[PDB]
Design a binder for this molecule. Structure first.
Ligand code: MG
Ligand code: MG
Ligand code: NI
Ligand code: NI
Ligand code: NI
Ligand code: NI
Ligand code: NI
Ligand code: NI
Ligand code: NI
Ligand code: NI
Ligand code: NI
Ligand code: NI
Ligand code: NI
Ligand code: NI
Lengths: 259, 260, 260, 259, 260, 260
């Protein structure tokens, strides 16, 4: 039976305004979650956090964007390492899902030899040809690898059911990034779980008290949040924002899980 | 008389730096609120018209809660109708009102000129009537939602729209800061090309890609619109006029002076 | 309790035949104004809610000049809130208000149920806020332009939207009569499939392609929407309920009777 | 130097409501104009009115649509005949322009052996695959001829300048028909002349006192009329509605012309 | 009863390799022309129906010049009406005709079944009526341009269209080979999922990205549609049936044998 | 001074007929690789610049596997920087580089001119960065994926883009061969209009609708783009220059000769 595990690749250090737009220049620290769904029909990694390379050399691997987001993580938090110690070898992952292709969500890309990588086509196309303000957040070393098998979703694919059994669905949430997608999970005991990811960074974004401090479209972003509100209200899902420092310790992590 | 360009202002706006340059801190910041008059043999043209004259006496009553972000400082004589009357132009003597977009500091002219055709992008007019929560406070329905206003709502294929058909005023569509935002390319007999960026490029910093708009509908569109204006300025050699730049603004002639 | 469908009406509308069947002459014509209640274990659902209860006492004051086309005849007890209270349902006990579209005889419920999420197509909400001259009179801003209404604005890819996730109420997008017009496919335990065409098909004549809507945004869309509903009814075997048909309307059970 | 000639192929008999939507069932009669622009670089026919075949047998050629529009015309009014007596043989026409492909505007189609026929692509595509309510107004015998040379305009072609000299421009006016187009002419002495064609049947449509009694989209139709208002106000053009029975005798017809 | 899938063919087509595998040389090449029958408790379904029976006895007369590209080798008794009659199904007992697209070897069924609703993408029907010169010869108007035919034209948001509403037969939109081309995902009780790629992948080489269609509207759509079907097959474990593969065709069950 | 057009070539490409004329057989075939210089008072313009100079001396090393389709036969001195230097133009004296598209034989100029603004359709640039498997080998990232390069990316509504604003050089959008492919209409004082079709029509057979492109993104776009150019040539009386025609290429003037 399927289970959800919440991991993290350490934290990112930045300023408040990078997360809550225009909220000032104070220091601010957020967890970097990523997810594992163990399913009878194959294992699934979502995003996989920051590249394990960031543990030993952020400036080398990420480059000048470390001026904005400084990652704090240990080697053992790298998604491949974390899965091994958990009992899952790289070859044992059937799918990698990508909410989007920003730097702290492409740690899994190409690190699982048989995994099909599912992302919206327009995120993939934007990641390859970004504008100047967002180029720094796309790490080509992660996602620009010719060996990666991609399933690029189209606009009709909103709601894409990974296994065909309502366990994992893509919920398109454009705004934070062009092809950004959220995920709605249904687990046997827990029921519906809504992973907003970066469609709603924090509880304040969810409550319409802040805007994303980094975004492609504000119009899309706020409409995507209200799309998630309606989905939460309809399903009764448990809502997981993408990075909320206050809410994050209140979820089960680590070896603990949702069934 | 050959066409001329007159730069007016409706006082200033007081906000924070981050409202203009995204994520740039909460320090106090004050900007001029420019608006433009083009006198033309075939009719006088008002662009936007600045903040409603009502803001000179009761900003909180007329704009409401948004004044905690943008406090307008202006005198009553700076209202666009009053300013034009002092300058020599009666309200009925305006043929066109052009709108870059329909935000609160660009709708002081809407409906104040009884014979003017108001030209704005259709998608701006529609968004102004049905904004999202993050922008609703920047659209003052009392300004632009008036039943007897004649509108010419431009369509997507109307980029480059030529007001008089003589190349002297063209709409340059620049989406991003607002969905239907438009800039203007003017051509004047002596000055030559003048590019009014309006809110496509708040400041010289925005033009130089050292800052993002701290109030916008689409970042992707906004950065691409600035590069579209880079190319136009490089092609035409235009004098580039940013929307609000507090340091550049004193370097331009202001009404009663003009650009020939 | 298993879900049920209750058919109410807010009296009738008096117009001409040509307003309903395009170009069919200027004879007097009267139609019922139906609206629908779905009682459901997970929450009660109101569809449209008919003409505003205000029309029972002052139609000219509330609707204005459009009453020379559509005169509403209704009693105050037929207002949707009043009718639901008499039937046993307090205004706070409504989870969803669904809107086929936002025309004047389909917005009596908007904002009258303080806890309801209102579900309508985004493009209908936007058109209602910025209509064209030929349709502006059919949209009553006092009904739908209320600040504290919670809206869930459906997108283009939301065709088939399932309200409870259990197949019992689905939006069937049917553009044409209005830009964001939607029909509804209901599934009930005993009755089975019920297709509420609403204004996609005013009458049996419209359904049979012997008449066009005498008030529409797009004929092309409207005829294709009727054929989309033909296919749905053929696939599902649904009971087909037209929007206003004065001859078919007496043949359905009306509240307090219901479809199980 | 270029000149404009206003011809007509008799009249159509119908009901008021067919022209002014919902205006009642009274009898009503309208002229069917078509246009000739003589230009140094080639002659141009616009639409060409009703098929000459309609003079002798409407029911045979148009079919059941004659229940709605009964054409009253003489053989000699057929655009080919009219041009011959005027001094222009079929081969001497360089372009046929089509506002749209309805029955009373396809009399020229294929009747000029060397003419390129310019129409919006989407009108051509709709004419080939109409819906049930509009099929009767598309006469395939006119426009479905394999020998016809077509230039199908695209959406970017709004404003299409036929000769490249501002003499004749297409002004796209969707609404009455999907690909319906109006024409703005500039003549040396007359100046700007705006042929609305069926974007505004009558002076009442122009003044927003009526809607087209036959249309693909009302939203498009009214916005197309306001597009023409702005164009008339900007240029000072002389406005020619498509069928106005009261205004039609006030224009020059016949051998008379606009220079 | 449970549904069944039967695979028929209307003989073969002779052409060159390059016609099927773009730019692969001028050697002679021969492919079967499959079509499909699904028996279903709620009605019989014919998919495409192969080449018209009329072209068996006079290819040049019914198809014209295109026969210099595709020579159909086919007996009269392989016509889809004749084959079905022999199989036990009179033309009146077919509820739906599904069209992958409207090319000449997929319109033998059109209008031959008097009561059948024909389901195809709207944009294929519209393209078939107004094709470009390179594709015009591939559309046989005598097959599909019949006014007596009942069509259900699917819109762009109808991808995945479920014919009976029970997951047995779904349209899988696969643009590229033709603008409105569609594949089919079937689900059968014993066999499980069956993916009829039809002309989205002519042969196994196409499936494996070693060839492009030698006749096609959009290469970009075509290759992405093949990858869409890859992901569907990998997700479902479907039996993959290419449209024409001569080496694979003998390995499937053909009527009178079936898939249950 | 008046503008002039000079026609250069970077040698030839060897391939098969079918590569240029779809499905026309596997015989050997050889085509020139033209590129263009326009001298203009306001600056020099290079169009495409042919095959990269790097591939003259090591084709497999710079182009990789695609050389098994296109073998470039080219001397180092035919590289566009070397040719221009010999002609009298240092790389710093080129104001604009225009790209018909970003295929391997049209990106020899990219980033070789330090001060040049590169003008290409946005959708060609985006496709070149994320191409499909069938086209990936045709895009040489070492040519166009250089961060030092100044791009002006044209939007969909930029068809007809006038480089100097004086009708000398205009982009004529011709999708099909590549998604963002563009042709060029030049106007020169003595010669008059010159239509550079580039890869919208490889050869005269393509122009005459006797062949399809053997490499292409959309056949439908391709054939309609050829007809768009037909109507432009018929309207303007332009000299029509196909992209590669081996029989027509010797009949044009080549550098050092020019068109005035
Ligand atoms: Mg355009
Ligand atoms: Mg959809
Ligand atoms: Ni992100
Ligand atoms: Ni993030
Ligand atoms: Ni603004
Ligand atoms: Ni402003
Ligand atoms: Ni209605
Ligand atoms: Ni109604
Ligand atoms: Ni007409
Ligand atoms: Ni007409
Ligand atoms: Ni085919
Ligand atoms: Ni086939
Ligand atoms: Ni090429
Ligand atoms: Ni080439």
């Amino acid at each position: 039976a399927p289970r959800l595990y919440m991991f993290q690749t350490g934290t990112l250090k930045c300023r408040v305004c990078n997360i809550k737009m225009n909220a000032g220049l104070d220091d601010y620290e957020i967890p970097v979650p990523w997810y594992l769904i163990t399913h009878p029909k194959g294992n699934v990694v979502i995003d996989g956090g920051c590249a394990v390379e960031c543990a030993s050399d952020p400036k080398g691997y990420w480059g000048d964007i470390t001026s904005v987001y400084w990652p704090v993580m240990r080697e053992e938090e790298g998604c491949v390492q974390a899965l091994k110690a958990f009992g899952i070898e790289p070859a044992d992952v059937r799918y990698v899902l990508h909410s989007h292709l920003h730097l702290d969500h492409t740690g899994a890309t190409g690190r699982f030899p048989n995994a099909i990588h599912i992302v919206r086509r327009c995120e993939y196309e934007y990641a390859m040809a970004p504008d100047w303000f967002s180029a720094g957040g796309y790490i080509r070393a992660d996602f620009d690898r010719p060996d990666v098998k991609w399933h690029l979703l189209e606009d009709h694919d909103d709601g894409y059911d990974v296994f065909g059994d309502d366990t994992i669905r893509f919920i398109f949430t454009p705004g934070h990034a062009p092809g950004h997608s959220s995920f709605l999970l249904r687990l046997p005991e827990t029921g519906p779980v809504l992973l907003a990811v970066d469609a709603a960074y924090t509880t304040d974004h969810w409550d319409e008290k802040a805007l994303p401090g980094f975004l492609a479209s504000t119009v899309d972003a706020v409409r995507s949040v209200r799309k998630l509100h309606a989905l939460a209200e309809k399903t009764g899902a448990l809502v997981v924002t993408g990075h909320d420092p206050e809410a994050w310790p209140t979820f089960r992590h680590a070896p603990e899980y949702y069934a």
